[PDB]
Amino acid sequence: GSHMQKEGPEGANLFIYHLPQEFGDQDILQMFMPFGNVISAKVFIDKQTNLSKCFGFVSYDNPVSAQAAIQAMNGFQIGMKRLKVQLKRSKNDSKPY
Template sequence: MVDQSLKIFATKLPREWTDEQVREYFSAQAAVLEVSVFKDGGKSLGCAYIKFQSKTEAEEVIKNLSKEVISNKKIKLRWADGEAERLKIDRAPLPKPARSKYIQYTSSDGRPYYYNTETGLTQWEEPIEMAQPIKTPSAPQGPPGCNLFLFHLPIEWNEQDLIKYFSPFGNVISARIMHEKESGRSKGFGFISYDSKISAVNAVKMMNGYQVLGKRLKVEIKKGEYLPEYVLYPSYQPNPL
């Protein structure tokens, strides 16, 4: 059985660091097997996955380096989530029932949710049996302030899932999930672009912290695209459920 507790996730790393520099830094504490720096357009996002030979070594690294300060920033280390999901064998598609037991409703802010006529429960996630194929937009990105960075995405998601969950807030012109080159597996982060700043603001307000498939999404305006309108919107508290 493969030990899933060998990889940690590091944030607040210097953005100028390359994969080799990250490897060199952590190798001073333990043997590093793998390094994967998150990048956008070839530029580091200041976070990375680091894999070690054993759980004990990984635990020591988290213990010894969690308070280290580099370039006036205290790096943050934690266990990488979703490692078991990354190694699952691809699941066969679920058959769609002839008749759906779900009814779709829309909340006061325009967001769809679903009522199960058999259990009497409601949910935000669109039921698999109701899902329809979605064409993925191909534009590279939107205007400044319209592009979102998404982290902690479910490993099972693809670009169509991004469109399904983020299109209620506006016209999505680009959706990307970053993948590992060799394995093709999702890295757990990606990007969404709208043609409107208001759409981007609403998506952050409503989807940041949203829980799905055991994950809590992190959604924020892409770095360097300051959006002052964001502070004009109050916190969102869903009430249909």
């Protein structure tokens, strides 16, 4: 259950390059569900920092659920596209929040 794009603690963010066949909001919510709860789903190009185009955005709640999705999501073969996953700017530190 989500409505826009707002990440939580320092440690969890991954985005999708090469998005296969029509892959829209409904697919991303259930095919990326099987290791825990997700806070952002949208297939738009972000118009403020001009990042990579016709591409996809997902986010989770804690740094342990990112390490399992990089192994089962690097390599997904479906027709004439491959899935290729990238994490957005890593950081491991203790902030007062």
